[PDB]
Coordinates of C-alpha atoms and ligand atoms in Angstrom, one line a residue:
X1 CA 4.3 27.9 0.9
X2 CA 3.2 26.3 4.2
X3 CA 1.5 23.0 2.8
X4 CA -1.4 23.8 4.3
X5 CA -2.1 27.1 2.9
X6 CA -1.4 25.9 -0.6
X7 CA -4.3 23.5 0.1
X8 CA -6.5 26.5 0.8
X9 CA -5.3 28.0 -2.7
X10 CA -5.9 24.8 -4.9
X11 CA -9.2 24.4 -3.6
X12 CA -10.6 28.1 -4.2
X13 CA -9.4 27.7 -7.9
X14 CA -10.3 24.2 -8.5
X15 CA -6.9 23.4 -10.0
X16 CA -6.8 19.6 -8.3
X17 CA -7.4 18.2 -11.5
X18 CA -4.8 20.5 -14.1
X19 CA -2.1 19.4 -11.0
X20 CA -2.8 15.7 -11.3
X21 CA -2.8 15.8 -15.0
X22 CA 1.0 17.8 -14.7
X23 CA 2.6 15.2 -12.4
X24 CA 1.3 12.6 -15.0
X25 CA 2.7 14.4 -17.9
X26 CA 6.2 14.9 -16.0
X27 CA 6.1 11.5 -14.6
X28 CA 9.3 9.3 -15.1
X29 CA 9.0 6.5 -18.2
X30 CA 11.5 3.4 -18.3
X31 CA 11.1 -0.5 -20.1
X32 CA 9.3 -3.3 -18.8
X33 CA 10.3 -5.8 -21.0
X34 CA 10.4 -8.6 -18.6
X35 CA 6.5 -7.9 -17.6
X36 CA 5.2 -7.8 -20.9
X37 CA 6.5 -10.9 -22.0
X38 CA 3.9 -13.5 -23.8
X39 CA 4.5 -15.6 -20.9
X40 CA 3.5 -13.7 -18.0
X41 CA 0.4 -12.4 -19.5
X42 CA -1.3 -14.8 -16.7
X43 CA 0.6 -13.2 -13.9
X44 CA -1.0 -9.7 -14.3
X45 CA -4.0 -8.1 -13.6
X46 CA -4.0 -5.3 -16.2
X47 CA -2.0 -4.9 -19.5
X48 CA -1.4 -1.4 -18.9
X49 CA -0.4 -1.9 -14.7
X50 CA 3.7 -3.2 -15.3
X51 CA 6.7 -3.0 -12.9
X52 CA 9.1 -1.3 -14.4
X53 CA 13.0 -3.3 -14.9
X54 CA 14.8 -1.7 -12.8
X55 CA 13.2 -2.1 -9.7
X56 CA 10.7 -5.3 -10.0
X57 CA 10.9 -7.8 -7.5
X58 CA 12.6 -11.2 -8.4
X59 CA 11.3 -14.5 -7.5
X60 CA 14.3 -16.8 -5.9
X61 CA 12.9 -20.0 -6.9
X62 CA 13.8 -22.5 -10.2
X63 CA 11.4 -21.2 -12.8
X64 CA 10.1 -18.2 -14.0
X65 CA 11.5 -15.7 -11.8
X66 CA 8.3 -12.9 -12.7
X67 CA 6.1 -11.2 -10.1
X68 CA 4.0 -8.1 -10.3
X69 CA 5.9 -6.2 -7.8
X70 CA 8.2 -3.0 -7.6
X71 CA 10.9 -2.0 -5.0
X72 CA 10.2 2.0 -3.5
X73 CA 13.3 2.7 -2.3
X74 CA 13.0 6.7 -0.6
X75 CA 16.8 7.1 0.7
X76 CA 16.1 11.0 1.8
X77 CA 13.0 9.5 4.1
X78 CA 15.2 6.1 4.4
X79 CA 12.5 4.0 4.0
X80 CA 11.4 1.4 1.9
X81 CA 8.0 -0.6 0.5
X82 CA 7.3 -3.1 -2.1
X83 CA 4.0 -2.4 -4.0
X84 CA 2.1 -5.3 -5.7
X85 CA -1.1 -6.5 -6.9
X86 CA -3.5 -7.9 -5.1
X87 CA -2.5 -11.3 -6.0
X88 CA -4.8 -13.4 -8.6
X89 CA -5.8 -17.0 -8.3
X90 CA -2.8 -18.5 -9.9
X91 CA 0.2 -16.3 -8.0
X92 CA -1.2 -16.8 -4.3
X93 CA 2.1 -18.9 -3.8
X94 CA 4.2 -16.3 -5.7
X95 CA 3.0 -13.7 -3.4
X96 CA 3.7 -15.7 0.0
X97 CA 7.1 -17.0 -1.8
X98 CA 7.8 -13.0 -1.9
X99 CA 6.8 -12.4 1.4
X100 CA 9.5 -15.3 2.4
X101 CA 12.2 -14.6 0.2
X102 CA 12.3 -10.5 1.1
X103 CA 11.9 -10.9 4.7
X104 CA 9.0 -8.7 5.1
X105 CA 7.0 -8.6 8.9
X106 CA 4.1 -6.5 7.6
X107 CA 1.5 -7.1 4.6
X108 CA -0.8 -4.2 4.5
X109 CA -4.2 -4.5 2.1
X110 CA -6.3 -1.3 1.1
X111 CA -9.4 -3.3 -0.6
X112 CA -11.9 -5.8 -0.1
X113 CA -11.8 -9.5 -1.9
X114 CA -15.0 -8.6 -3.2
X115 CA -16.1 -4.7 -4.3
X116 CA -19.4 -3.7 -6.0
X117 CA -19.6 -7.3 -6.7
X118 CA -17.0 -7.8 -8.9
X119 CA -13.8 -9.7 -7.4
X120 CA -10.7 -7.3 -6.8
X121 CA -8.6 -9.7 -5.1
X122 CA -7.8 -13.1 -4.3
X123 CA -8.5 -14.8 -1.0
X124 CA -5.0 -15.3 -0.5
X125 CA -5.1 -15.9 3.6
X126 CA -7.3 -18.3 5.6
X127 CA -10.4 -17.1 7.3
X128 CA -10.8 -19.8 10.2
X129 CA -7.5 -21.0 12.5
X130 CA -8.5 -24.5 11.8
X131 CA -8.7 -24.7 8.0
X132 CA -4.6 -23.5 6.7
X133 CA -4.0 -23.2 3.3
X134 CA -1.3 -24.7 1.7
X135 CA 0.6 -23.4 -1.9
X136 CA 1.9 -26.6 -3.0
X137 CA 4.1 -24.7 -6.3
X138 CA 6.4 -22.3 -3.4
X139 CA 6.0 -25.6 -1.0
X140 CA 4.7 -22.7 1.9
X141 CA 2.0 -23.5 4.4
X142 CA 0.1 -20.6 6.4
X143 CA -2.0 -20.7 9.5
X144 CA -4.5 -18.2 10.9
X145 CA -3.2 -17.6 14.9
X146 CA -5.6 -14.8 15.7
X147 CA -7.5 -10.9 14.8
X148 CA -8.7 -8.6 15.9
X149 CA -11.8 -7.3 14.2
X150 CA -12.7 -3.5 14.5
X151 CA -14.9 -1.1 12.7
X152 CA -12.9 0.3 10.1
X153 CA -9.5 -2.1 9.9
X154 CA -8.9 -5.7 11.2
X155 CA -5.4 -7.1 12.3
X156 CA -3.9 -10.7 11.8
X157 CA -1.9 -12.8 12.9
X158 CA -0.3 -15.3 10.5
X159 CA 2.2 -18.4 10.7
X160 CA 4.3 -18.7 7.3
X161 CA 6.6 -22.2 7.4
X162 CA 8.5 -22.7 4.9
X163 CA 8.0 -26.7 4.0
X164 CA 11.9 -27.3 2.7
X165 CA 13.4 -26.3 5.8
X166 CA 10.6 -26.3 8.6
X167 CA 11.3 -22.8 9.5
X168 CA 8.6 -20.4 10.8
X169 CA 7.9 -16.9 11.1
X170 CA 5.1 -14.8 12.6
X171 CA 3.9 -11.9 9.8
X172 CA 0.8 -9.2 10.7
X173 CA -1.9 -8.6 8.5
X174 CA -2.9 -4.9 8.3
X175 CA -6.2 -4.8 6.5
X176 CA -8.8 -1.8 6.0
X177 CA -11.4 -2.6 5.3
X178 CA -13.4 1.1 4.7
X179 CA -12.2 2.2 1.5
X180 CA -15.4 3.6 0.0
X181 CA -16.7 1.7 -3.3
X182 CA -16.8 5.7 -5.0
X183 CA -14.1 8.0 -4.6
X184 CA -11.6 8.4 -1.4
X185 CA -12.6 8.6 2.3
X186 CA -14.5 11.9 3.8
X187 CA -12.1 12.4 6.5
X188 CA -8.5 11.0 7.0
X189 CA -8.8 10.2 10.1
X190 CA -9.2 5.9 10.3
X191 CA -6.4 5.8 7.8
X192 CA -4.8 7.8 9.6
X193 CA -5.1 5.7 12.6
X194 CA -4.4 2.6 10.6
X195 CA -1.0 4.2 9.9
X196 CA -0.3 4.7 12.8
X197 CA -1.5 1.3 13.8
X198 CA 1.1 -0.1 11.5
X199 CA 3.7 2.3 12.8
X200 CA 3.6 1.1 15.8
X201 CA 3.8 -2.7 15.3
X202 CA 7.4 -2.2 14.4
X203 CA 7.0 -3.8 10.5
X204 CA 8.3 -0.4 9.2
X205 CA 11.4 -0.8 11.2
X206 CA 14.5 -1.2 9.3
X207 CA 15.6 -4.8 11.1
X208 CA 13.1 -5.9 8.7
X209 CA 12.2 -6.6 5.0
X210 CA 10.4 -3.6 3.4
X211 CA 6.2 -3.8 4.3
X212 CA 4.3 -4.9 1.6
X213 CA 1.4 -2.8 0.5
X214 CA -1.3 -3.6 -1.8
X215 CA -4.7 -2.8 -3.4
X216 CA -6.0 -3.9 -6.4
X217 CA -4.2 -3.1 -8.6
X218 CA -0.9 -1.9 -6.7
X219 CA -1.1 1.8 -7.3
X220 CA -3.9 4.0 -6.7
X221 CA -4.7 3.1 -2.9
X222 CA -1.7 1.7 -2.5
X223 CA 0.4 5.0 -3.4
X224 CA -1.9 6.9 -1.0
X225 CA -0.1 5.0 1.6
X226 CA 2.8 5.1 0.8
X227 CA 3.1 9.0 -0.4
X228 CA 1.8 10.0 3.1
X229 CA 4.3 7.9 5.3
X230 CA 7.0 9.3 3.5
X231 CA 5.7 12.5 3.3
X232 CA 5.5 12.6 7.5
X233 CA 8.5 11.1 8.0
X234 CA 10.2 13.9 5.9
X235 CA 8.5 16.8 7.9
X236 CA 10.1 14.9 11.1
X237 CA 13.9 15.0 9.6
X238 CA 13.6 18.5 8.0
X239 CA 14.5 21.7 10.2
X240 CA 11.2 23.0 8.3
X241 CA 9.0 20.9 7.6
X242 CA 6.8 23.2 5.3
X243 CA 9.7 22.6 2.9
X244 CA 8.0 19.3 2.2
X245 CA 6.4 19.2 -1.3
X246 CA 3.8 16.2 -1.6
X247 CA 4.0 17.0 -6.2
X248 CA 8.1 16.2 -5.6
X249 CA 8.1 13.4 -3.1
X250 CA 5.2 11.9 -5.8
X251 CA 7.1 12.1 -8.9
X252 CA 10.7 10.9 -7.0
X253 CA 8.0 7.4 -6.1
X254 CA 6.7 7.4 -9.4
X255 CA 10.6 6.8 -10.7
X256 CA 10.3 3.2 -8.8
X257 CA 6.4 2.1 -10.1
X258 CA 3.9 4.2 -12.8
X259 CA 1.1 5.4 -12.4
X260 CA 1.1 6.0 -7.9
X261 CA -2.2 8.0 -7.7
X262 CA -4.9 7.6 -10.1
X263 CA -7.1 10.2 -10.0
X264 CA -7.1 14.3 -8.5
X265 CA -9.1 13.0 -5.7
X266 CA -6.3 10.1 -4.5
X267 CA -4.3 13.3 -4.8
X268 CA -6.6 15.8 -2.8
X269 CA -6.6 13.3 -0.1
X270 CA -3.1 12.4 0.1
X271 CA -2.5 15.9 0.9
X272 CA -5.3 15.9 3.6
X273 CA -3.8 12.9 4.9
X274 CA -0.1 14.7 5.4
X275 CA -1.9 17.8 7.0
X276 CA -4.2 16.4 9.6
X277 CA -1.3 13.7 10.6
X278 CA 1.4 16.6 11.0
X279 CA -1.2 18.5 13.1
X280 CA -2.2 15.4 14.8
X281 CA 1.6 14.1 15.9
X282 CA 2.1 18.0 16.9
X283 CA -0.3 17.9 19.5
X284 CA -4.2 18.1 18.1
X285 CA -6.4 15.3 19.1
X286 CA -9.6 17.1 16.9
X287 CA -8.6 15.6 13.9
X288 CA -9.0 12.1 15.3
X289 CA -12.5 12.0 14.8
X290 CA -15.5 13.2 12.2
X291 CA -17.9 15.0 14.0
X292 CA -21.2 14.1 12.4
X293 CA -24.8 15.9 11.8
X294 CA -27.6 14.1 12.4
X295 CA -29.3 13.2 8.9
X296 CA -31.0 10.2 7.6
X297 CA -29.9 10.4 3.9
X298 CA -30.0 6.5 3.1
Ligands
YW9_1 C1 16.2 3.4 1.6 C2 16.1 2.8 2.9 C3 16.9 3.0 4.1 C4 16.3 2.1 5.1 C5 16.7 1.9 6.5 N1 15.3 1.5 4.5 C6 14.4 0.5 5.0 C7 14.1 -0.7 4.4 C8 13.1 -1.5 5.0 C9 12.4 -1.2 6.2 N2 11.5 -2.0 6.7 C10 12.7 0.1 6.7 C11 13.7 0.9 6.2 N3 15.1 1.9 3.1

């Protein structure tokens, strides 16, 4: 019952994987018609990766109104977050257009550009304050103004203008930078604190545009994120917050993008993620840090 203690349960028997493969099997299946359109077949990363109809993200602009994106809208939590991509070469201005249009304050990135090297990601942000990019197609211009590099996540800040109107706005730039090349994290604990981090900028507040949240592909890494930030903000509204079931609040998500949480081990640490940030906002500091043994295994 008490989340925890069915942790202790599925581990003893193994059963992470037969739990993953139910939620699959339940999981919600609508059209996206619109996505797989001979058209857009440039605008996407992976055939089998589509935002569903219902709640894709429309671009504003005269032409082709098609990005790779999907509206999570959690009313019992009352939150919201786009998923996406990570943007490819040709929908950089797509993605900042987006950004614009939605009125988000927050982009929050779960990979690296380059991964085992193969490239994951676009470079879709300028590395050095002097040298801006411009996306001619969305007419936007965007300016490095500073970061703050640390050892596991790095935070930005960025100037977007809009080039019709003149208009400005300051948007952050959560990026981790950690994410192991195999498998999920050890511990929670630094994304954890990146959470937090991001918490406490204010760009989850609801004076703005939902955050946007992506990975590679926009729903492996990406749904970890989002599944424990909803999951902890439900144990804070709920008179008992061991009612909160991670395999419901999962499947209620997966009715607004397929396929959030690609393997049992996303899964397994979602969970850990939810338990050690409960127990951490309740008043224990020991899950802030991985105590380590001292090995040379490298
Ligand atoms: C559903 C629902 C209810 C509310 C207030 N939001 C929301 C939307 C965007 C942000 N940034 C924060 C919250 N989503």
């Amino acid at each position: 019952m008490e989340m925890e203690k069915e942790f202790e349960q599925i581990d003893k028997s193994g059963s992470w994987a037969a739990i993953y493969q139910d939620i699959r099997h339940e999981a919600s299946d609508f059209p996206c018609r619109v996505a797989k359109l001979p058209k857009n077949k440039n605008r996407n990363r992976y055939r089998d990766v589509s935002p569903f109809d219902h709640s894709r993200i429309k671009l504003h602009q005269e032409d082709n109104d098609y990005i790779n994106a999907s509206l999570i809208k959690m009313e019992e939590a009352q939150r919201s977050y786009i998923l996406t991509q990570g943007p490819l070469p040709n929908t950089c201005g797509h993605f900042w257009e987006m950004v614009w249009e939605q009125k988000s304050r927050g982009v929050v990135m779960l990979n690296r550009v380059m991964e085992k090297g193969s490239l994951k990601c676009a470079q879709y942000w300028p590395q050095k304050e002097e040298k801006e990019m411009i996306f001619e197609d969305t007419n936007l211009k965007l300016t490095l103004i500073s970061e703050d590099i640390k050892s596991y996540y790095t935070v930005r800040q960025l100037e977007l203008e809009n080039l019709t109107t003149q208009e400005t706005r300051e948007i952050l730039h959560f990026h981790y930078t950690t994410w192991p090349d195999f498998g999920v994290p050890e511990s929670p604990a630094s994304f954890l604190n990146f959470l937090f981090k991001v918490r406490e900028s204010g760009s989850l507040s609801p004076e703005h545009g939902p955050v946007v949240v992506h990975c590679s592909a926009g729903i492996g890494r990406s749904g970890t994120f989002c599944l424990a930030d909803t999951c902890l903000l439900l144990m804070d509204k709920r008179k008992d917050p061991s009612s909160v079931d991670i395999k419901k609040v999962l499947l209620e998500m997966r009715k607004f993008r397929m396929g959030l949480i690609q393997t049992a081990d996303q899964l397994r640490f979602s969970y850990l993620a939810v338990i050690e940030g409960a127990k951490f906002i309740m008043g224990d500091s020991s899950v802030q840090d991985q105590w380590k043994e001292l090995s040379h295994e490298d």
